[PDB]
Amino acid sequence: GPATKDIPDVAGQTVDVAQKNLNVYGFTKFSQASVDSPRPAGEVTGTNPPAGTTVPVDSVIELQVSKGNQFVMPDLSGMFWVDAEPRLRALGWTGMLDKGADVDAGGSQHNRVVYQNPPAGTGVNRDGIITLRFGQ
């Protein structure tokens, strides 16, 4: 019957490209799930089962597909809010600021971003909430 093969990694590939490459491996049936991701919309973020999993070539592979609805969280350390806000907006952030309590980071950090959530490098939904805490 059908062979069993390792699912190849197709992360970053468009659904069109991913399916074509998977077809060449002998995989024939697919399903698709939309996921939150900063990757360009239509790009595959991964599969279910994951890459490396040995499965029948005639078993369903679910393609996790990026909505392209996230931006990558910048490092806002040391910025005043007057500059950090439009910087975030320029990334497509339509969300809202939740300002936490001031922290003791020294006089040089007065009214400057000290702590942030989510951390830099994290994928953030466009309407996501950003938590910032400024120096006292």
UniProtKB/Swiss-Prot annotation:
Q: How does it assemble?
A: Homodimer. Interacts with the FHA domain of GarA, FhaB and FhaA.
Q: Which residues of the full protein are shown?
A: 491 to 626 of 626
Its name, as the record gives it, is: Serine/threonine-protein kinase PknB
Please state what the annotation says regarding this protein's domains: The intracellular kinase domain and all four extracytoplasmic PASTA domains are essential for PknB function and cell survival. The PASTA domains interact with peptidoglycans and are required for PknB localization.
Location in or out of the cell = Cell membrane
Limits of the PASTA domain: 1-67, 68-136
Instruction: List the induction conditions.
Output: Expressed predominantly in exponential phase. PknB levels are regulated in response to hypoxia; its expression is down-regulated during hypoxia and recovers to aerated levels upon reaeration (at mRNA and protein level).
Q: What else is known?
A: Overexpression causes major growth and morphological changes that indicate defects in cell wall synthesis and possibly in cell division.
Please give the function described in this protein's UniProt entry.
Protein kinase that regulates many aspects of mycobacterial physiology, and is critical for growth in vitro and survival of the pathogen in the host. Is a key component of a signal transduction pathway that regulates cell growth, cell shape and cell division via phosphorylation of target proteins such as GarA, GlmU, PapA5, FhaB (Rv0019c), FhaA (Rv0020c), MviN, PstP, EmbR, Rv1422, Rv1747, RseA and RmlA. Also catalyzes the phosphorylation of the core proteasome alpha-subunit (PrcA), and thereby regulates the proteolytic activity of the proteasome.
What does the PTM comment of the record read? Autophosphorylated. Dephosphorylated by PstP.
Natural source organism: Mycobacterium tuberculosis (strain ATCC 25618 / H37Rv)
Q: What happens when the gene is disrupted?
A: Essential for growth, it cannot be disrupted. PknB depletion in M.tuberculosis results in cell death and aberrant cell morphology, and leads to complete clearance of the pathogen from the host tissues using the murine infection model.
Q: Which domain of life is it from?
A: Bacteria
